[PDB]
């Protein structure tokens, strides 16, 4: 992972747009340029050519700019490709790029690093470069918790545990061949290897079916029952989603709807009205909505004008404010203004927006939309977040493949241990770090080695 690695990353923001940018800066920049374009165009010239594949088909048509160093953003061999801002086509192109040996995806804000330490960028903004990296890394880490969040994050746990068990039983009888542990060193080891491989396929087939990612920035609307949660969601969606009545706790199951706003996707989440639940369904729905709240990105706490004129979110529901994560931005909506008559518009309360609108008729709907877009969302939304997992898991099956083949020859356990360690190192990029000391701890706890 030297500073000479050729990396591939996306420059344009996630979402819908007419242009998408993929940039490459490294030694293999010329290699990638020849691989994708099958040639090298005139330097610093707005050349034109489509994106072909190994099979010969075209993945996209656009404009390519090749910038040899040092007169570039990062002062190195930098390749820029411009096409169409389609998330699926972008993912296909990135997958095409990554199969080349020696390539890897960039980390949060790596190009700032490269263009900074090569002295291709001014030096005054060190304090700003110290944040453009941290924010990107934090958002990337926040993501991928949706990548491994369903049943998919149930087969990887199985794979990791099986590999750990195999390594415990394969590495113990290379380091403690003087105790009584009745190691599995016999041929059955290879049998226990097979299932592990047979397990990996399952994981690789788990994400090939199910939901459809649906990239975007999440949003949450909640409150007490009969507070307008149904009406607000219906108005935002533009079509009927949930029933509208005066019955307390009318809706009991969470609802998710998708809406685009001038090329900036957002996802609307509906939840049952917050209150004390006297029913199993109500209590479980309250728990589900509460759990979805923390993972949310933007929230609009319900503030019914009829109930009271209190504006401070803390005063209205101090417990809810306290429970909320600190970083979570909060917006205030004063519902039912058309009956209360409070003037429509955008207002700020203690640094948080206080908005009065008529949900029952649509008054003030634009103002909330105006705030939402004006609020912002850096990168790493979905498709790119799950590419890291499918890549790390990708470059561990081949490790096992080339490790198992060794057994067919002379049975040397050191090479098997090496390959298994490499495979677990590549798997650690998904779940977590598994150091050489943790394996020893598990071995100690599993056997009676002692002394």
């Amino acid at each position: 992972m030297s500073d000479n690695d050729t990396i591939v990353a996306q420059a344009t923001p996630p979402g819908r747009g007419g242009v998408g940018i993929l940039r490459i800066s490294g030694f293999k920049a010329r290699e990638v340029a020849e691989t994708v374009l099958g040639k090298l165009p005139k330097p610093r010239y707005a050349d034109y050519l489509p994106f072909k594949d190994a099979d010969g088909s075209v993945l996209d048509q656009g404009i390519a700019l090749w910038f040899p160093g040092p007169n570039s953003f990062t002062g190195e061999d930098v390749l820029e490709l411009q096409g169409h801002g389609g998330p699926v086509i972008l993912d296909l192109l990135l997958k095409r790029i990554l199969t080349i040996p020696g390539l890897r995806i960039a980390r949060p804000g790596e190009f700032s690093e490269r263009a900074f330490l090569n002295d291709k960028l001014d030096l005054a903004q060190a304090e700003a470069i110290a944040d453009l990296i941290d924010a990107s890394s934090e958002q990337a880490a926040r993501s991928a918790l949706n990548s491994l969040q369903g049943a998919f994050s149930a087969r990887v746990n199985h794979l990791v545990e099986a590999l750990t068990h195999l390594r415990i039983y394969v590495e113990a009888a290379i380091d403690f061949p003087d105790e009584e542990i009745d190691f599995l060193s016999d041929g059955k080891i290879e049998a226990q290897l097979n299932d592990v491989i047979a397990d990996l396929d399952a994981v690789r087939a788990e994400a090939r079916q199910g939901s459809l990612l649906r990239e975007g920035m999440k949003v949450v609307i909640a409150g007490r029952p009969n507070a307008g949660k149904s009406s607000l969601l219906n108005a935002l969606a533009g079509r009927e989603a949930a029933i509208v009545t005066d019955i307390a706790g009318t809706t009991r199951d969470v609802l998710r709807e998708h809406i685009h706003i001038d090329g900036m996707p957002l996802h609307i989440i509906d939840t049952a009205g917050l209150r004390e639940a006297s029913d199993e369904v109500e209590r479980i729905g309250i728990e589900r909505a509460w759990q979805e709240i923390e993972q949310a990105d933007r929230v609009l706490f319900m503030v019914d004008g009829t109930t009271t004129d209190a504006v401070d979110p803390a005063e209205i529901w101090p417990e809810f404010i306290a429970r909320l994560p600190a970083k979570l931005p909060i917006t205030v909506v004063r519902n039912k203004a058309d009956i209360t008559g409070e003037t429509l518009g955008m207002s700020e309360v203690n640094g948080h927006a206080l908005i009065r609108l008529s949900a029952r008729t649509g008054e003030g709907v634009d103002v909330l939309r105006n705030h939402l877009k004006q609020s912002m969302t850096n990168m790493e939304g979905g498709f790119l977040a799950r590419r890291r997992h499918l890549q790390a898991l990708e470059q561990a099956a081949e490790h096992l493949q080339q490790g198992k083949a060794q057994l067919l020859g002379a049975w040397a356990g050191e090479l098997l241990a090496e390959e298994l360690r490499l495979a677990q190192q590549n798997l650690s990029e998904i779940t977590g770090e598994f150091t050489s000391d943790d394996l020893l701890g598990r071995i100690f706890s599993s056997f009676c080695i002692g002394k």
């Binding site: 790596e110 900074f116 060190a126 941290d134 890394s137 380091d175 061949p177 040397a412 020893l440 009676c448």
Partner: protein, 624 residues
């Protein structure tokens, strides 16, 4: 008071690391002083009388290749020799010796008594001298004090040790030795953090009260191996066997019944050191293996391996008297544990120098380790660095890629755990190239650069390297074809007969074939007489691909390896790093960006931010 001669380096405590430090410093042409508690104890083994093992023989071979004494005092004091993992790959084998004790002690003392440039002195130490973050001089007990340009402490386990048996205790460095009390307080006052650890050993049986007529035997090995790259098998004394026995349910019953009397339980590493732990942790198992080994060929004491404990004397006697062949047995030395002070290795540079004080070094037990082979390497490195400093030259420290010592130092600096540090083969990430047979191949030259290797070793290594290169070139100069006149046998006893131009170099690429087999043939003429050099060609040919992969991987981290971080850095003065990471780094205080990256809790984002900060302050010439 002040002695009238200034020395270069002063070693305090001639244990297992002090002797190595003194030998290295003296052989490196610097006047060396060795202050010791008491003589005739040089080379004493206070625990299992064995040398080597898995992860220990590697350290012993490193010490030998650097010009040490550990591997030369066992070729003349060992009564049993074995090779562990003989059937597996060469990269994981080990050598273990059951060593006679008196012979080892005499050999060590004689070797250390006739060293030019080195002087020994018998005295205790009650304080040190420092002014302006510098250590200059040490104070003994009589009143005489010495001046030196560098100091090395190898106190071991004597820093205010306490012997515990059952629920009672008394002061003692070990069984029969006094404690070094005042120096504990004196070192405590310094800007240091000190803690305690504890470990025990079993009793000693009388070899003429055990009915060895019904106990299974265990022998040594035919054409027995050696440790040093110089000696041979004509130097080993007569060998002796070991006796194997087991336990039974009565012993478990007694242990469980009397478990109340014990400092633990009653009212800890991740394994089970004692025997009561062995039973309680795994209560279903109803049998355990016990070894009885002779402490020498002129003494009738038997060391029982496998039955260490902390229970009172009565339980010890009952456990002894409840095993087959031990019906009527005698004990001459009771088992016991000891608790001793130690320093955390997060305030000493990778060269085993305290990051705060100047000239002070640490080695041996006080570095939070355990074992003979884990102290000799530390002492050797500390003495080497102390001599280099006192001579006003740049120090030296190995990397994780060229010596187990590098792995040991790096882990002891950046681990943070609490278990006593034991070396294991899998504990190093470069096993496939950090073998034993090649230790000199990768270390001796460095010693010659630093003047740690004399002429005999130099000549032997040069001859061996010439043999290796000649064999490689000659094997590279062969070629065969399927229609070869002698190809009939080659295809007959080799699978997949020749189908095109062949070559011995490519011939060996098959896994089934061997080196001697290929040698036994008209082509590929008789192999060289020195098979010790011959094995290297086989290892290289069979591990070339993995070696190349590891080599190109190693070369890429070198920039982070070089990038240093001064101990005066204040990470609170960096923008963009989380509070927790700031606290972690401020506590650890790494020496390079790579060593920090090896910490747990620091991710690539933190290192990137740190690099950006470095480029802003000009604290780096470049990061490429």
């Amino acid at each position: 008071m002040f002695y009238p001669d200034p020395f270069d380096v002063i070693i305090i405590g001639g244990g297992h690391a002090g002797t190595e430090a003194a030998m290295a410093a003296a052989r490196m042409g610097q006047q060396t002083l060795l202050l010791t508690h008491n003589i005739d104890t040089l080379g004493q083994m206070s625990c299992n009388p064995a040398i080597g093992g898995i992860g220990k023989g590697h350290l012993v071979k490193e010490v030998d290749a650097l010009g040490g004494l550990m591997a030369k005092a066992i070729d003349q004091a060992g009564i049993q020799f074995r090779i562990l993992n003989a059937s597996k790959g060469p990269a994981v084998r080990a050598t273990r010796a059951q060593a006679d004790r008196v012979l080892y002690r005499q050999a060590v003392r004689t070797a250390l008594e006739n060293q030019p440039n080195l002087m020994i002195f018998q005295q205790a130490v009650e304080d040190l001298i420092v002014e302006n973050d510098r250590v200059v001089g040490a104070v003994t007990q009589m009143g005489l004090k010495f001046r030196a340009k560098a100091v090395v402490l190898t106190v071991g386990t004597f820093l205010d040790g306490k012997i515990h048996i059952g629920l009672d205790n008394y002061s003692g460095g070990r069984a029969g030795d006094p404690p070094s009390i005042p120096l504990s307080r004196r070192l405590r006052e310094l800007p240091l953090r000190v803690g305690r650890l504890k470990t025990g050993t079993p009793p000693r049986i009388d070899a003429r009260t055990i009915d060895f007529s019904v106990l299974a035997q265990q022998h040594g090995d035919n054409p027995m191996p050696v440790f040093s790259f110089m000696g041979n098998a004509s130097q080993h004394p007569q060998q002796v066997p070991c006796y194997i026995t087991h336990t039974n349910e009565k012993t478990h019953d007694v242990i469980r019944s009397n478990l109340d009397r014990s400092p633990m339980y009653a009212g800890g590493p991740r394994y089970c050191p004692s025997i009561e732990d062995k039973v309680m942790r795994f209560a279903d198992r109803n049998q355990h293996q016990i070894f009885l080994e002779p402490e020498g060929l002129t003494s009738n004491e038997i060391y029982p391996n496998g039955i260490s404990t902390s229970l009172p004397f009565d339980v010890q006697m009952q456990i002894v008297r409840s095993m087959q062949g031990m019906e009527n047995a005698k004990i001459v030395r009771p088992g016991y544990a000891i608790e001793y002070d130690f320093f955390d290795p997060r305030d000493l540079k990778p060269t085993l120098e305290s990051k705060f004080i100047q000239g002070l070094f640490f080695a041996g037990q006080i570095n939070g380790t355990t074992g003979y082979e884990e102290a000799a390497a530390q002492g050797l490195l500390a003495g080497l660095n102390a001599a280099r400093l006192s001579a006003d030259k740049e120090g030296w420290a190995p990397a994780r890629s060229q010596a187990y010592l590098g792995v040991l130092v790096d882990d002891l600096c950046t681990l943070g755990t609490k278990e006593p540090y034991r070396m294991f083969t899998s504990r190093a990430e470069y096993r496939l190239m950090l073998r034993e047979d090649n230790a000199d191949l990768r270390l001796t030259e460095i010693g010659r650069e630093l003047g740690l290797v004399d002429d005999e070793r130099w000549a032997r290594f040069n001859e061996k390297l010439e043999n290796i290169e000649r064999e490689r070139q000659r094997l590279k100069s062969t070629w065969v074809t399927p229609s070869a006149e002698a190809a009939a046998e080659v295809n007959a006893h080799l699978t997949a007969p020749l189908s095109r131009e062949a070559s011995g170099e490519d011939l060996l690429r098959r896994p089934e074939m061997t080196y001697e087999k290929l040698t036994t043939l008209t082509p590929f003429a008789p192999a060289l007489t020195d098979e010790q050099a011959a094995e290297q060609v086989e290892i290289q040919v069979k591990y070339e691909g993995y070696i190349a992969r590891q080599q190109d991987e190693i070369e890429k981290q070198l920039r982070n390896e070089n990038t240093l971080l001064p101990a005066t850095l204040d990470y609170r003065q960096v923008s963009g790093l989380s509070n927790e990471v700031i606290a972690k780094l401020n506590d650890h205080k790494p020496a390079s960006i790579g060593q920090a990256s090896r910490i747990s809790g620091v991710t690539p984002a933190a290192i990137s931010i740190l690099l950006v900060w470095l480029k802003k302050q000009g604290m780096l010439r470049r990061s490429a």
